[PDB]
Amino acid sequence: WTATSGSCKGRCFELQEVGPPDCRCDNLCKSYSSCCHDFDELCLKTARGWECTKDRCGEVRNEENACHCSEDCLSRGDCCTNYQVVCKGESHWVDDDCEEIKVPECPAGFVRPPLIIFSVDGFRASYMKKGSKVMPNIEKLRSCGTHAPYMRPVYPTKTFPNLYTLATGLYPESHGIVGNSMYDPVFDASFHLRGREKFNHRWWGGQPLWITATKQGVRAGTFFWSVSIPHERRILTILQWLSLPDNERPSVYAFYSEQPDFSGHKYGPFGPEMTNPLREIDKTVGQLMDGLKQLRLHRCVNVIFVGDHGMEDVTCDRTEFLSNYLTNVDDITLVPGTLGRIRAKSINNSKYDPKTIIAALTCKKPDQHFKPYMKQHLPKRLHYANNRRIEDIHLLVDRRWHVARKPLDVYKKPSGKCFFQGDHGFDNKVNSMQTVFVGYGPTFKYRTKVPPFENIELYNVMCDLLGLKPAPNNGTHGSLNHLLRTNTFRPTMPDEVSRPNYPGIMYLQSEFDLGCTCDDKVENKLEELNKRLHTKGSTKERHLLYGRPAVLYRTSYDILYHTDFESGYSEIFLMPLWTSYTISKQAEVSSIPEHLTNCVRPDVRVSPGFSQNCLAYKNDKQMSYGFLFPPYLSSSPEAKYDAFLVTNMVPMYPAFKRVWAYFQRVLVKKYASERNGVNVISGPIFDYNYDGLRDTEDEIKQYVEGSSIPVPTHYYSIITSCLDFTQPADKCDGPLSVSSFILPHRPDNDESCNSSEDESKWVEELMKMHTARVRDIEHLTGLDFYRKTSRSYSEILTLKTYLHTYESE
Numbered sequence: 001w002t003a004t005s006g007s008c009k010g011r012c013f014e015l016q017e018v019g020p021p022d023c024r025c026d027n028l029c030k031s032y033s034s035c036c037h038d039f040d041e042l043c044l045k046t047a048r049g050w051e052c053t054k055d056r057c058g059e060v061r062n063e064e065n066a067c068h069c070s071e072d073c074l075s076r077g078d079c080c081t082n083y084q085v086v087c088k089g090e091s092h093w094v095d096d097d098c099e100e101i102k103v104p105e106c107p108a109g110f111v112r113p114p115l116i117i118f119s120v121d122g123f124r125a126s127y128m129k130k131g132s133k134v135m136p137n138i139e140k141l142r143s144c145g146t147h148a149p150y151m152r153p154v155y156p157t158k159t160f161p162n163l164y165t166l167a168t169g170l171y172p173e174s175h176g177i178v179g180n181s182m183y184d185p186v187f188d189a190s191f192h193l194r195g196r197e198k199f200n201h202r203w204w205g206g207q208p209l210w211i212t213a214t215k216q217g218v219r220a221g222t223f224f225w226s227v228s229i230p231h232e233r234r235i236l237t238i239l240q241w242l243s244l245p246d247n248e249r250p251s252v253y254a255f256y257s258e259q260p261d262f263s264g265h266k267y268g269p270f271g272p273e274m275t276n277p278l279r280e281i282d283k284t285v286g287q288l289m290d291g292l293k294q295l296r297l298h299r300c301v302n303v304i305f306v307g308d309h310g311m312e313d314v315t316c317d318r319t320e321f322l323s324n325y326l327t328n329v330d331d332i333t334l335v336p337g338t339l340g341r342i343r344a345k346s347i348n349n350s351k352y353d354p355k356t357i358i359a360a361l362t363c364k365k366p367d368q369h370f371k372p373y374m375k376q377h378l379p380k381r382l383h384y385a386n387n388r389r390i391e392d393i394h395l396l397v398d399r400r401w402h403v404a405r406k407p408l409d410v411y412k413k414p415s416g417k418c419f420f421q422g423d424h425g426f427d428n429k430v431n432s433m434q435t436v437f438v439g440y441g442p443t444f445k446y447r448t449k450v451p452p453f454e455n456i457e458l459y460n461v462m463c464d465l466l467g468l469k470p471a472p473n474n475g476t477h478g479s480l481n482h483l484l485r486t487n488t489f490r491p492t493m494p495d496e497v498s499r500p501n502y503p504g505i506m507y508l509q510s511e512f513d514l515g516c517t518c519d520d521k522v523e524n525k526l527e528e529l530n531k532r533l534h535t536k537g538s539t540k541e542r543h544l545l546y547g548r549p550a551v552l553y554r555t556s557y558d559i560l561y562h563t564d565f566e567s568g569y570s571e572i573f574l575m576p577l578w579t580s581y582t583i584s585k586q587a588e589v590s591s592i593p594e595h596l597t598n599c600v601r602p603d604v605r606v607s608p609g610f611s612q613n614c615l616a617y618k619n620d621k622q623m624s625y626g627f628l629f630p631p632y633l634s635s636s637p638e639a640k641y642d643a644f645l646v647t648n649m650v651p652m653y654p655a656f657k658r659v660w661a662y663f664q665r666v667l668v669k670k671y672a673s674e675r676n677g678v679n680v681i682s683g684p685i686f687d688y689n690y691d692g693l694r695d696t697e698d699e700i701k702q703y704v705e706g707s708s709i710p711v712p713t714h715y716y717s718i719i720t721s722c723l724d725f726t727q728p729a730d731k732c733d734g735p736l737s738v739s740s741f742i743l744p745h746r747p748d749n750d751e752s753c754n755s756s757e758d759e760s761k762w763v764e765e766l767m768k769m770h771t772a773r774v775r776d777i778e779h780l781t782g783l784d785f786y787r788k789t790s791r792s793y794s795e796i797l798t799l800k801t802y803l804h805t806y807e808s809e
């Protein structure tokens, strides 16, 4: 109940929300059906439209007008945005040459430059180039300020998850807005775009920017605008708020536009109808900047122009139907469209089985346009699993496609045709899903291009721009320092928590009873001192190029040196946490020799009690083993024996070994040839609770049968070289280049529908799908990489957030 018979007189777009049943006059009151009776009349004036004309200049104030052209309007803060242009001979902001904003030029009483977030729904990254001729205000922001060629949204690339990620710095699995539609099994409640459940605070986790600001004494404009409030009124409201007395005036504001997304759904991303929405958005930016200029704030405010996601061509004929795959389609609930999420229709149905649903959906049609995954098997870069609102079965849908349960869900009578031509929601690495970032103002750099970055990073920067301490989030604070003229955030590297042991030769061969064998009994002061030096770390400078990784948790581990590689060996997990080696451009690939095929050698530096054993592998009929440093890349026949040490061994399913062996035998050398040497760091990852974070020992669900050897859920590699590829990886003077992956350690290759073919036809495709940031691997391992480089720490933070996408231009 609302007692809608209070009044909005003097309350229009009030910033404090009044509680039920008293009536509201804030920018969201319409959405709640709660506005006072006179809200439209007083707060939503339209009379005479939005622009001054020559005949209106100097008019007697008429309080009925949408905006004012009277002499008093500047001091009232309610002129039409083009007032000084029409009436005082001033220029539009877009027509002024740009001039560097070296310092804030703010009116007296401003404590800090205000921030205005100008958010545009469905603004695909390529609109900035493709629509530049029809967006002159936006193009001036972009060319004069700081811009990225694109900004990566979070998955799913839907509106609510991305807008709340912008506000919080959190992945959707952590903030809880995991789709536009959701069912929470604990609340037994559903969240929908339409309706009232979405206003309940229990959906919305983390701490959004407006709460962070308010807690720290920085006033915030109300971020959300009821759909029916025209954009011109949104802009005039922000400009009016900026004219408030210092003690009342917010420091942070948000504008939102439902375009170009609204039209993009109807017409496709590049439909000829799309030109007009882009023109209209540019006009709104122009109104804002002209309005700021009239208030002498155009060289004071930091403006962020930012989208939530892009837009792809999708039509209803490109729909896959689950009823073409499942016999039991009526026993499931599907959240459909550009991603699929499946759960049981009824919790009382004991015949429901996700294993049989996955199998029925796996590689069933030659050009099948979705792929089913248990959520823990989704690429880790998606960070899309650790929330009870995310169903266990997920369908990753190919770009340009939909999935639906039955054809009747898609068509409507009488004709059966559908009219949409665009959609979004796909994997966040897809080019059509990329969106925009421009920052313009005294705190941003001048005429500066920055590399693409993820929208999870922006919360930290918005906190920096407002002098706020960010709540804990998934950004890497400092990684966007290169966007900023000032207010940079200068973090210190985390402290190493566990220091390594450096064991020497402590055990005799006969102390080991591991059931291993090796034909190595094959027989010099010259060369013997040489081998001893390698074991003491004489080659470590070649193979550990950026320092040893730091271990950020409490554990017991050993550093082990060899001719061709260095490793940090865990006495708790019985395998390396990391193995580091450099392969030059000139390196040669060799085979595993016949006499060494089944060779595993005890490591006399590490006790039998802290070693794996071969008998476990012999007894475990599902599990084989691989090596982290590849024997194929040994520098000499003699050095190759090091690669067969039990301390270089890791558990691997035979199916996974196909992947691994191809990576090690073929792809590493290929990358070294292409990149002028590579440094490789590889290792295991244990994430049995799929929370994106390193498992402790007591979270491990699977061991090599009969043993205490834990089975990794994933294997990673970080592959680093010189950004200037004219310099070899091991003699690089300047910035670095990296690509990494986190491959799922699966006992089958069902994910790869072409896996019966030669590995040259499917393995690299798998690896691209599972591309990763170094930062993802840090979370998953508790290691901190690149500790010793010549580079600035912020530069290294940027490097650690890099994702190699494998998408064309």
Ligand SMILES: *[C@@H]1O[C@H](CO)[C@@H](O[C@@H]2O[C@H](CO)[C@@H](O[C@@H]3O[C@H](CO[C@H]4O[C@H](CO)[C@@H](O)[C@H](O[C@H]5O[C@H](CO)[C@@H](O)[C@H](O)[C@@H]5O[C@H]5O[C@H](CO)[C@@H](O)[C@H](O)[C@@H]5O)[C@@H]4O)[C@@H](O)[C@H](O[C@H]4O[C@H](CO)[C@@H](O)[C@H](O)[C@@H]4O[C@H]4O[C@H](CO)[C@@H](O)[C@H](O)[C@@H]4O)[C@@H]3O)[C@H](O)[C@H]2NC(C)=O)[C@H](O)[C@H]1NC(C)=O
Binding pocket: 170, 171, 173, 174, 175, 176, 202, 203, 204, 205, 206, 383, 386, 387, 388, 472, 473, 474, 691, 692, 693, 779
């Ligand atoms: C991305 O960045 C974020 C932010 O930094 C990272 O997320 C953090 O990760 C931490 C570790 O997983 C986690 O810390 C836990 O906090 C628990 C208290 O949590 C509440 O309070 C905080 C603070 O205000 C709040 O943020 C939380 O909000 C979550 O939960 C509500 C639901 O109430 C949601 O609305 C909200 O969206 C958010 O949900 C997300 O996180 C939860 C986990 O907290 C998930 O379950 C959801 O799926 C969703 O992802 C909470 O309201 C605290 O209880 C935990 O402590 C337990 O574990 C420690 C280990 O140190 C142990 O010592 C304790 O004893 C305790 O164990 C006891 O409880 C266990 C569980 O019942 C039980 O098994 C034991 O036997 C014990 O009894 C823990 O410290 C922190 O909450 C989140 N924060 C957020 C905002 O998500 C995230 O990791 C980053 N991602 C990556 C990949 O880096």
Ligand SMILES: CC(=O)N1CCC(c2[nH][nH]c(=O)c2/N=N/c2cc(C(F)(F)F)cc(C(F)(F)F)c2)CC1
Binding pocket: 117, 119, 159, 160, 162, 163, 164, 165, 166, 167, 193, 223, 224, 225, 226, 227, 254, 255, 256
């Ligand atoms: C129909 C639809 O698809 N809907 C429902 C209406 C909703 C909407 N209408 N009017 C608005 O102003 C607005 N959202 N504005 C923001 C802006 C930000 C930002 F400033 F950070 F960018 C964050 C958020 C938050 F949701 F994440 F909280 C919301 C848009 C999604």
Ligand SMILES: [Ca+2]
Binding pocket: 121, 122, 158, 159, 160, 261, 308, 309
């Ligand atoms: Ca959107």
Ligand SMILES: [Ca+2]
Binding pocket: 686, 687, 688, 689, 690, 691, 692, 693, 694, 695
């Ligand atoms: Ca974990």
Ligand code: NA
Binding pocket: 616, 617, 618, 619, 620, 621, 622, 623, 624
């Ligand atoms: Na075996």
Ligand code: NA
Binding pocket: 749, 750, 751, 752, 753, 754, 755, 756
């Ligand atoms: Na397969």
Ligand SMILES: [Zn+2]
Binding pocket: 122, 159, 261, 262, 265, 424
């Ligand atoms: Zn949309």
